[PDB]
Design a protein around this ligand. Structure first.
Ligand SMILES: [Zn+2]
Lengths: 121, 177, 51, 72, 93, 107, 193
RNA sequence: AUACUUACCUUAAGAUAUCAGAGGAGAUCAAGAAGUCCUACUGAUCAAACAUGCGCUUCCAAGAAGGACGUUAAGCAUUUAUCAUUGAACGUUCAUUGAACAUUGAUGCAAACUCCUUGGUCACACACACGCGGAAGGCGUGUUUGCUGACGUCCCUUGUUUCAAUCAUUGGUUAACUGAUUUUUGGGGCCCUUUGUUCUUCUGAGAAGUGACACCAAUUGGUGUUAGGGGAGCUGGGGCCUUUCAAAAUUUUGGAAGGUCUUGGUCGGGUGGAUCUUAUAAUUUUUGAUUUA
């Protein structure tokens, strides 16, 4: 997929990436992680869940693989029944764009606190 | 310990189940809540796409057509009209079959909204606490309304029409009332 | 194998690991030498110690 | 830490699905912070029936879910 | 305390969620009240057994540690829980 | 006394990992979490001779075309069954545990 | 519907009910780990077929610190067995000695007299020094002539324990090298305050 | 907004680099604890941010990547569409009684069309070998801090680009010439999906502003936006050159200063948050009941 994932990044740095998290069942969830926690409960935006069927599993044995996708959208997956997560797509907006966006979010937040201080007066 | 309510921008000094339930049912929370969710949707619908639109590089361009701009007052007016009309088209449903089956033997079990058994126990349970001061149900049978055209019902309502094309109707209907 | 460390959880470092199991379908017993291992105590059922 | 919200089901006939095919119907006499559940008049339903004595208590690990058979 | 995802599950109260269970059962219905321990209580529940049937519970209470995931509605994509920078209005004293 | 700290001394070291499933994983540790969520860049991972759930969990992780070559795999702690260290590494150096030493001086 | 009508109807407008078909996992009856578990007693042969044991050497590195701690404590106890024979201590009454410590270095002995003559006539005074540096260590031993002004010098309200001798607060005790039953100095695990 | 009443609730703990010395806490017993603790002390490693490089490495225009929760499509092949009891006829068929999605499906194999979203459809050039600014990662150097941040500059333009003419200023050469910059006029190209014909408002490009504007509910409450480019001043970093001083054997290294180029910017706290320890390896996510025996 030649995506070249950041060699020194873990979960909090992986935010808004498009993941391919894999579970104990062998089902795959694909989508933007928007949040995790201590127990690895993930949210997953626009998520699609794919299985292989039992029948297509025979072809998977030691190729074109009719994976079955249902569309779960905004789901919020659990840390108990997962196995492992990888990264599939990079996010939409680049590091400069994410950086300028975070600057604007912080300026707006400081401004809202100034407005709270004004209404408190 | 502290439960920050992101909508109310207030705190709960010590989290427990009962102050959470009583806060999330609280009318102040519901009002700021509804304002926020409406607000996010009207922002996302308002927010223009503004794609990059990577312009390619290209004889047969001989025809030239006139663009049509508008005045800034005219822009703001037609945008306001479109806002009101989107808000109508989303909200409006179609009555008809309520008004059609008005006299029916089992209208008052089926369309009267919580006598249906399926959604029925909801609307009793979804009723809000009525702490401030100030139904046609299953009892209705056939012999309640024996003969509907004795006691005059209103006619079937005349169908609705786009005002943009209201000028182009058949003038002078056959058969005056 | 010989044990290098202990855990509350019985996470165990093992050195010069012999491991050996049984493929039952007939049977081929397969063995593998793994010299430096870190084994989680969840899989560990029973620790027997020879004198 | 939080005790579960089975207060609405306090006397109403509930149906646990226990473990994946065990289905037990009783009346919810009790609950603790682990969803250990004390049922009265447990009557295990196989798809044949089997009654399960006067009182019973069922492990909140084994319990998957429970339905209110009685109206609320 | 909670952390972001179970706070989201505390947010999506009274709205149409869909749960898979570990058995493969995917309950679907309105979400009466979730707890912090992810025990979630649901209403007007339409259930899909592993065998492929469908039935209708009225009033289910599925335990948290057999939830496979839960799907909330789409709009909570845009939620103030996700805002990384919203500053705190002077915590109580 | 926990041994995850042992693994925390092992950033940029090349191990294999056998999972409770049966998946075998080859590729360096970039870090390790408190409860042993081990993140691993430059993986190629294999499944020895078979488990159908493991077959699905192998293929579906992209770049299968049964060695699957992946840039970056986070692995959850309760999936890691056993982890094979490099034999070049000296265990006498690592198990010394400066925290356990300080606690001996704390006593 | 829920409490407010507008966004519950329009905005949230949730997901389609979702398509189901056949799972891959096992439908509870067989979730098993491994009921066919090993029968270890065969392997008691194969360890003979396994046949030295490598040096642990890290527990040795901790055991060196533990053994050094016990050896230093034992050298302490050897200094504990090894104060009537001592020539610095004068064989006066222990009840008429007052100990002072936390003393400034440049404090002259005549000043020590001057702060101490207020209560009783002083018999003799030994301020303790290093024997190799000859810096004043910071503690001294006073015997008065009576016990009662040693006790009034021990009773401290407005006086000694808290007096600022050469711009520093000092500490003022009865001598416990002779008096109390179990006393060890700082070198011997004891000491006060 | 204020008052009154009711209901509910009021504190898990600790740490924030690590190791070794300098000094302190100048250690309450006859010269001394050992240890442990702190630090604008120093030294070493590590982590994070920022800057710079790497003649780093890879990816960037009818097609390529991804998707269709679309069709052709009942395309073709295969399979399946309850049990129990009783009666009758020769295991089957029919009838009665009792109990509990879908065949146009499902599964497999493809194949084609149509559609969708994204991307430097860049600059240069269109030719006979064996370029700058983008996006993602790796390494190196330097600074700063040992968690983070909260609480207690000016001017021009915003359709752009190119060409000619006029005028102003400045430099050089002998009033003439050449070059640079600014203004105006005109033409050509590209683009106007800028879909509301453009940071916000107003008018049909111009004008004003940088608390205001926009909008949904009932003056109040909520969310978003306040931009982009260029230049100058100043500041940070890197590279080169020159001078001086020191050290080592004309050369190397380090520091300072000046010039040129390139890139970037314009003390406290019962506060919270983040990370890591400890409760916490016992039913709810991390100390295993998902290799199906
Ligand atoms: Zn609130």
């Amino acid at each position: 997929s030649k995506i070249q994932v950041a060699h020194s990044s873990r979960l909090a740095n992986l935010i808004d990436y498009k993941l391919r998290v894999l579970t104990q069942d062998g089902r795959v969830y694909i989508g933007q992680l928007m949040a995790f926690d201590k127990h690895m409960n993930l949210v997953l935006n626009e998520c699609i869940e794919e299985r292989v069927p039992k029948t297509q599993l025979d072809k998977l044995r030691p190729l074109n693989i009719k994976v079955e996708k249902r569309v779960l959208g905004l789901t919020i997956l659990r840390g108990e029944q997962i196995l492992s997560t990888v990264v599939e797509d990079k996010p939409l907006l680049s590091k400069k764009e994410r950086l300028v966006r975070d600057k604007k979010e912080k300026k707006q937040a400081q401004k809202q606190t100034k407005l709270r201080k004004e209404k408190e007066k | 310990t502290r439960y920050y309510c992101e909508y109310c921008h207030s705190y709960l000094t010590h989290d427990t189940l009962s102050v959470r339930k009583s806060h999330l049912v609280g009318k102040n929370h519901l009002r700021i809540t509804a304002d926020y969710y409406r607000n996010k949707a009207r922002d996302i619908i308002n927010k223009h796409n503004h794609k990059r639109r990577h312009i390619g590089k290209r004889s047969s361009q001989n025809e030239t057509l006139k663009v049509t701009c508008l005045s800034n007052k005219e822009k703001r007016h037609i945008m306001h009209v479109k806002k009101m009309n989107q808000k109508e088209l989303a909200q409006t449903s179609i009555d008809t079959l309520k008004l059609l089956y008005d006299g029916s033997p089992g209208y008052s079990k089926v369309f009267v909204d919580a006598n249906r058994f399926d959604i029925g126990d909801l609307v009793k349970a979804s009723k809000l606490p009525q702490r401030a001061n100030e139904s046609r149900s299953r009892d209705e049978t056939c012999e309640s309304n024996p003969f509907p055209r004795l006691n005059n019902p209103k006619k079937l309502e005349p169908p609705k029409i786009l005002s943009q094309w209201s000028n182009t109707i058949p003038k002078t209907s056959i058969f005056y009332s | 194998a010989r044990v290098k460390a202990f855990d509350r959880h019985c996470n165990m470092v093992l050195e010069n690991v012999k491991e050996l199991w049984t493929e039952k379908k007939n049977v081929i017993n397969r063995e593998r030498f793994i010299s430096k291992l870190f084994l989680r105590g969840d899989s560990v059922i029973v620790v027997l110690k020879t004198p | 830490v939080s005790t579960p919200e089975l207060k609405k089901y306090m006397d109403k006939k509930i149906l646990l699905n226990i473990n994946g095919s065990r289905k037990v119907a009783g009346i919810l006499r009790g609950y603790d912070i682990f969803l250990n559940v004390v049922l009265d008049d447990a009557m295990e339903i196989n798809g044949n029936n089997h009654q399960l004595g006067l009182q019973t208590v069922i492990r909140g690990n084994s319990i998957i879910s429970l339905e209110a058979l009685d109206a609320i | 305390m909670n952390g972001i995802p179970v706070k989201l599950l505390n947010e999506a109260q009274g709205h149409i969620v869909s749960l898979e269970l570990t058995t493969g059962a995917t309950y679907r219905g309105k979400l009466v009240e979730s707890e912090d321990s992810m025990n979630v209580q649901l209403r007007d529940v339409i259930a899909t057994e592993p065998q492929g049937a469908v039935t209708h519970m009225d009033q289910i209470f599925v335990r948290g540690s057999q939830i496979k995931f839960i799907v909330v509605p789409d709009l909570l994509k845009n939620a103030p829980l996700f805002k990384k920078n919203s500053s705190r209005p002077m915590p109580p004293i | 006394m926990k041994l995850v700290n042992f693994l925390k001394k092992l950033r940029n070291e090349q191990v294999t990992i056998e999972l409770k499933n049966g998946t075998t994983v080859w590729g360096t540790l970039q870090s390790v979490s408190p409860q042993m969520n081990a993140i691993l860049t430059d993986v190629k991972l294999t499944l020895p001779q078979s488990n159908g759930i493991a077959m699905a969990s192998l293929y579906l992780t992209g770049g299968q075309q049964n060695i699957a070559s992946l840039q970056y795999i986070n692995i959850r702690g309760n999936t890691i069954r056993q982890i094979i260290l490099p034999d070049s590494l000296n265990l006498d150096s690592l198990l010394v545990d400066q925290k356990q030493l300080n606690s001996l001086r704390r006593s | 519907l829920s409490k407010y009508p507008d966004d519950v109807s329009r905005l949230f407008k949730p997901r389609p009910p979702l398509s189901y078909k056949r799972p891959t996992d096992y439908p509870y009856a067989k979730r098993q780990t491994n009921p066919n578990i090993t029968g270890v007693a065969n392997l008691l042969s194969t360890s003979l077929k396994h046949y030295x044991x490598x040096x642990x050497x890290x527990x040795x590195x901790x055991x060196x610190x533990x053994x050094x701690x016990x050896x230093x404590x034992x050298x302490x106890x050897x200094x504990x067995x090894x104060p009537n024979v001592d020539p610095h201590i004068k064989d006066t009454d222990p009840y008429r000695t007052i100990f002072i410590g936390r003393l400034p270095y440049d404090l002259d002995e005549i000043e020590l007299q001057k702060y101490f003559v207020k209560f009783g006539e002083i018999e003799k005074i030994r301020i303790v020094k290093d024997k190799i540096t000859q810096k004043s260590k910071g503690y001294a031993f006073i015997v008065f002539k009576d016990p009662i002004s040693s006790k009034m010098a021990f009773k401290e309200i407005g006086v000694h324990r808290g007096i600022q001798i050469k711009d520093r607060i000092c500490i003022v005790d009865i001598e416990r090298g002779r008096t109390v039953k179990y006393f060890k100095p700082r070198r011997l695990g004891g000491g006060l305050g």
